[PDB]
Design a protein around this ligand. Structure first.
Ligand code: HEM
Ligand SMILES: O=C1CN(CCCn2ccnc2)CCN1Cc1ccc(Cl)cc1
Length: 394
């Protein structure tokens, strides 16, 4: 006898388990057990993943309901699971979305200058360099301090909450509440701080005092700061880290992108498609009985949308494990989700990665791992797959 198949399958972000393609072929919606002991439906084909993400009867916010089967423990107050919904309801969606585009004057120049300064410091110090802790993550943190309008010197302390905040735990995490409450207090002070006039926090600070927003709660304004910082920093630093591994392991591609940097955007789109940064499927709770493939999902059941299941599906992306810069459907991957909850930071995340890669390849065209790939240490029970350190030479 064997137990019910457990998720997640592997915390390694450098290879996809052969198991995923076997599941997709045999049982593209299959029962699994999560780390909490709950049962869930794991969806692993492009067609069924799209179906789930485009049907709002598979609800994000209802995953926070008391008593529901859970992927993992909440790390925020349950209303924050409906974060973008709350933003929309407050009339703040357009403003938030405008503040987080990479098109603000000087932002791309700031990103480039920051990337180049980080790389120059690594070059001065000498190999080996850690491209996660001393490049990708500080570039993410600096970008988000700029986007938010908060001091660069406050980035590191906000960043250090994230190794706990984005845990994927069976049980509530006491440190997550301590850091959440602290980071909320910080953002509440930022809204009252007259020096903060630019970026997302500067714009929220002004809307807070405008009559059209007089009944929006101060808790929501502070929450938007904490959540956008954390979500953006963890996602962009983690994606860039694991994309650099995929690039370094493909010297022919590295050389092509170094020689023809106009191909970087197509390259980043393929790196997005093959990315294994999300450690778990995206959770949804059924609010009705819904047919998904051969399974009738019942009301109140948990469904997990496996992004790599979709993005490595050969029926949608032929030769899925190969980076091909001339696919006819290049942006049709699910790396930023799909439907109601499609990532509002998608443009910023593309630009962060494009600029970080462009700068790396110009400064370190010989970049290579400085340890055998199997020696990377993959963070466990976390919402992202990331190596603890990424040692390189050049
Ligand atoms: C390469 C970088 C990123 C990746 C791969 C990524 C991926 C995703 C995915 C897959 C979703 C959908 C989640 C779901 O449907 O359950 C999503 C939603 C979200 N992303 Fe990102 N993201 C990135 C960058 C960012 C940035 C830079 C921000 C903010 C500054 C951000 C903020 C959010 C928010 C707030 C949502 C929820 C949207 C809603 O619920 O309507 N992300 N992202
Ligand atoms: O606002 C969101 C959106 N998330 C979408 C999936 C993760 N993600 C992050 C970036 N791109 C995708 C889910 C959770 N929350 C609430 C939340 C955000 C940030 C913190 Cl620090 C605490 C809670």
């Amino acid at each position: 006898a064997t137990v019910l198949l457990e998720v997640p399958f592997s915390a390694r972000g450098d290879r996809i388990p052969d198991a995923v393609a076997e599941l997709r072929t045999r049982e593209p919606i299959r029962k699994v057990r999560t780390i909490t002991g709950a049962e869930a439906w794991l969806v692993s084909s492009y067609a069924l993943c799209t179906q789930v993400l485009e049907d709002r009867r598979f609800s994000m916010k209802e995953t926070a309901a008391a008593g529901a089967p859970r992927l993992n423990a909440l790390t925020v107050p349950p209303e924050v699971v409906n974060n973008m919904g709350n933003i929309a309801d407050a009339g703040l969606r357009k403003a938030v979305m405008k503040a987080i585009t990479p098109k603000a004057p000087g932002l791309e120049q700031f990103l480039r200058d920051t990337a180049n300064s980080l790389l120059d410091n690594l070059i001065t110090e000498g190999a080996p360099a850690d491209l996660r802790n001393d490049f990708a993550d500080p570039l993410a943190t600096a970008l988000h301090c700029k986007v938010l309008g908060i001091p660069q010197e406050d980035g590191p302390k906000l960043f250090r909450s994230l190794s706990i905040a984005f845990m994927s735990s069976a049980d509530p995490i006491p440190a997550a509440k301590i850091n959440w409450d602290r980071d909320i207090e910080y953002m509440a002070g930022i809204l009252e701080n007259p020096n903060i006039t630019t970026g997302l926090m500067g714009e929220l600070s002004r809307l807070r005092k405008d009559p059209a927003y007089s009944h929006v709660s101060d808790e929501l304004f502070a929450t938007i700061g904490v959540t956008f910082f954390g979500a953006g920093v963890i996602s962009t630093g983690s994606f860039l880290t694991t994309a650099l591994i995929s690039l370094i392991q493909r010297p022919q591609l590295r050389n092509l992108l170094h020689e023809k940097p106009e191909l970087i955007p197509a390259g980043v789109e393929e790196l997005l498609r093959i990315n294994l940064s999300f450690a778990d499927g995206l959770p949804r709770l059924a609010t009705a009985d819904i047919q998904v493939g051969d399974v009738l999902v019942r009301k109140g059941e948990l469904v997990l949308v496996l992004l790599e299941g979709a993005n490595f599906d050969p029926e949608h992306f032929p030769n899925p494990g190969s980076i091909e810069l001339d696919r006819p459907n290049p942006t049709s991957h699910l790396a930023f989700g799909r439907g109601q909850h499609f990532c509002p930071g998608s443009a910023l995340g593309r630009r962060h990665a494009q600029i970080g890669i462009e700068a790396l390849l110009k400064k370190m065209p010989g970049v290579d791992l400085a340890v055998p790939i199997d020696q990377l240490v993959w963070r466990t029970r976390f919402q992202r797959r990331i190596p603890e350190r990424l040692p390189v030479l050049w």
